[model samples]
Target chain A: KRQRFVDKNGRCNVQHGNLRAETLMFSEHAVISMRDGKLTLMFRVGNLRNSHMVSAQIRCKLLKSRQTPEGEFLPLDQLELDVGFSTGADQLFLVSPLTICHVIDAKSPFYDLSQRSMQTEQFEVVVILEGIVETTGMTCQARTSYTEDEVLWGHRFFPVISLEEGFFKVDYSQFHATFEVPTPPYSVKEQEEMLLMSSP
Target chain B: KRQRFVDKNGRCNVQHGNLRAETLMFSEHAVISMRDGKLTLMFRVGNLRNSHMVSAQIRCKLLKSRQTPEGEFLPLDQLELDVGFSTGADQLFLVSPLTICHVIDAKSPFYDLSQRSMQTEQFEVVVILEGIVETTGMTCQARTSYTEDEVLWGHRFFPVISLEEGFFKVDYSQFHATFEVPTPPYSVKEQEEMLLMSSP
Candidate 1:
């Protein structure tokens, strides 16, 4: 009997359960900086579960292999890689652990991705995550990728949050740690062709 | 040229990129305990990321509505909520924040479920999460669910880790906090039929 609803002292009402997925965690590489002058591209995500993964979003892609210009070929050739769908930084407040940048200007696509052509190139940079599982609403997805020897041209990351004594801690042994800094090994189209030969 | 690999001064090699998704979060409710004496069920997952979502796994489900001792019918039915997939607790490191249990006993399926039949019953409880994105190795999933008013029949949780003076911190403002304690309002098949009618 699929229909049941009672009340006026009859007492029934009836109702019951089911549904679900999970996946979120990444990084181990995929870093790159030169922030201020652009060329960003990062990747770090963690949500082991203090429980919150609602409305979180972030996505990316870049699997290279093209040819076009008429000769048409495009193997993996994807591209997107924004991560911040128009600045919401791809909307996320995962309660921590996030570093998903992705700048690389000039309409990106890594704007000529450099660092000595990332050691002779060979692309791959997937990254994805979506959420809304506030304990049983379902809709979670997680992904990761980052070829080119796992990336890391001039790194960053390693603060593991602070503000102790009253709240917000997080150390996890420096989460996935990272170091190096001073970037600019040239790329964003050779630093805009070396700033057009040092201008006037 | 689809084939390239040289080295030995011919220097060629070759390779390149793209792919993705994101989702991993849950828990705004869903708790219950009685740890040692059985009857458990929990939910909590937070990784906000220090980077790492590799090989983690955990799944569950239970939508309720049955009737088969020959009567047939079984709407929405579907069970299997062993967050531990046989002892591995469904495997997850997540760098911290986890909780994901599920006990209930006598071969569970909520062995006659109780707490007043979870309040006039209307079942649901789905949870999932799979991992591996150590910076884009791909394969990440996240999910969440729980009905019966998001669950919470006598709770727990709120340790947010410890061991400070040199590591293992965490705080997160008591991550999703929780309190209640004194459970035992009966149901593990009425406490095993009231311990088999007070012993023989």
Candidate 2:
């Protein structure tokens, strides 16, 4: 189901440096889905600022798995959503399916070896629907979420930095992208050699 | 008329710091009518590092003038080209056109005037194109020529920085841009504000 609401309570948190303030406002909700042993969640929000500001960041926590004193509940394995909206709006939004991908946990040396390591993992992809949202202008924001289906008991797990500054933006027309854990044989030896030689 | 010629005796002068040398190599040229002005100039050369290298330059001497010594000649304008190629056969190139837009007498008091005044009297316009040429595998070069009429000067003038970087191949499909020029009413107001804000 798709719906829109405003947070008149202004309970949302603005966490980026120098951009933090109580005056900022937001409102959003996600589309939940489940299919073939996967869960998806998608949401979007409109941000308003009365005064001119430099930058701002919004954060959200995913509730995929929960632990109680008696036991733990495992939901779907993976989640992915596309976060964006129409032009001239100063907010970021997302849409997700309750079941998008499967989640798995692998062994790691950094954690306690004696205790069984069971952690849910998903590949999170965030895309900026607008380029450099100027002080008084508006922009759209979106995301693509993913998870690994296969469960490897003894494989070492590594965290990846999915997004960086100076990357991703929706210039014109509709913006769309997909993210899946890249398959092996990903080495580009020939391309690397060519780039090295091409430089002066 | 379309014709190709090789300049076996072509001379390109390079003056950077104290190091100076002349390399005699084969250069290509094509001449087409102004009616069909869309012309692409391509060149292939070995790499040079951290140096102001000129791959090609078009020089023209003023032939007709209202005030001048009879039969006296002066270098009226020049177009300098710089080509950058990386080891992986990737190439970047620049084409710069130096045109005399306005001629001001150096002896006049206007020479000591403010930037605004100098801008009004400055007589020059330089157009440069810089971009990368993507090629695969080994270092191989190819040249493509087009008629001048195909060229489109959409605007009366091009930006100096852009023309200096437009020689290489660019993926027009994924390109994005922003305009920072002044807007109508704001432009006039900004000029007045600047006059008042300047050093007293």
Candidate 3:
């Protein structure tokens, strides 16, 4: 009954399918601080269903919540980020699994949060990823979020993944892999010292 | 073999003992919005590995993020929300499941979002729940987040299980119950008129 929109050639131009959009493809549950002195997030993107995704885009924002007398919390504007995708939304992004990163900086709302504040405060970071589904022409989306506890703060993830001739190997489980410490990013204690020196 | 920190009185004194903390004690994985025009989330809390929780506190902040060139995303400050729970960290909290709600209002981040923005935006509402463990006097915390898709806008969930003199029941097949309505959120003609009115 929905086929009336198809072209005369009998080719189905209707774009529709279940993309199985989900928010659980992240390597870890929170934003990470690598030894490189940059805050980052690494996530795996998957095409759970057979339908392909095209022109994918991932962007993020950090927001704050306020409460009212009625006792309901409303999110307030914090900042819109300059998010760049490590992986483009080409065909490969849809057919296979891919890892992506977010390099956050100065304009980021997290730039000035004190170490203790990051840990003891009620802060949350939300990440949004979306793409156009080939069959549906309609856009489908996925989301994943993080909290203070998930940040390693001063370490970087290692290259535990390797691709071989006939087989692929991941040294550690992607879902349970622990981070390594090369120690480039300073500790929370060190960050406190820096904050004191540059106190605004 | 790991019980190395016992005092002469046979009391545990080490602050280094493992604290079993988890964020997943809920029936659903994301924040929910009932069609009643409120931002909400439901999650179950648990006491893990015999670390009996005696008291629990649920506090939340709707946070925002900003990003930069070297590409580091920073979480900006937002108001701490008015989030208090009815269930204390009592013994039953550890063994049984509990669901909680976030009454999102004009003060909440979800208030201004149009229906489309909720579905396509990278907005995430992050929630943190913490509990006090009686044995260790340490804190156990969990984080849960929500996106637009999970919201049951203008809709409420139906009972999955029932018990009475009429007997108990839930559909195993109904465990996967879905929502359907012959009516859409809006009629295309109504949307067209609204567009014309807002076309400044």
Which candidate leads in DockQ? Answer: 3
What candidate 1 gets wrong by more than 4 Å, as runs, is A1-39, A43-200, B1-29, B32-54, B66-76, B79-118, B124-150, B153-156, B169-177, B180-200
Q: Over the stretch B91-173, how does candidate 1's per-residue lDDT look in tens digits?
A: 55454466667888778787777777788888889877877666655576777778887788878766555433333455566
What TM-score goes with each of the models? 0.26, 0.18, 0.36
Q: By descending TM-score, how would the candidates be arranged?
A: 3, 1, 2
Residue-by-residue lDDT tens digits, candidate 2, A67-98: 45677565532222222111101222211111
Q: What is the TM-score of chain A alone in each candidate?
A: 0.34, 0.21, 0.59
The whole-model lDDT of each prediction reads 0.65, 0.23, 0.44
lDDT of 3 by residue, B8-102 (tens): 12232222112223433433443344423334443333333445343345665656664757788777645554444221112122222233455
Candidate whose TM-score is highest: 3
Instruction: State the lDDT of candidate 3 residue by residue for A1-200, as single tens digits.
Output: 33343367744233222222342244554435552455555545544554556666565544344453433343332234435532333223433345555555554456555445566645444455555567766555445445456555544454444544333343434432546554434434456568899977
Q: Score the docking of each candidate (DockQ).
A: 0.01, 0.01, 0.02
How accurately is candidate 3 docked according to DockQ?
0.02
iRMSD value for model 3:
20.8
**Number of the candidate with higher lDDT, 1 or 2:** 1
Tens digits of lDDT, candidate 1, A1-200: 33324456744332211100124566567788866667787767767654567787766656565554433243334456666766576778766566778888787778887888788878766665667668875555565566777688998887665553334555555656788988878788888989899999
lDDT of 3 at B163: 28
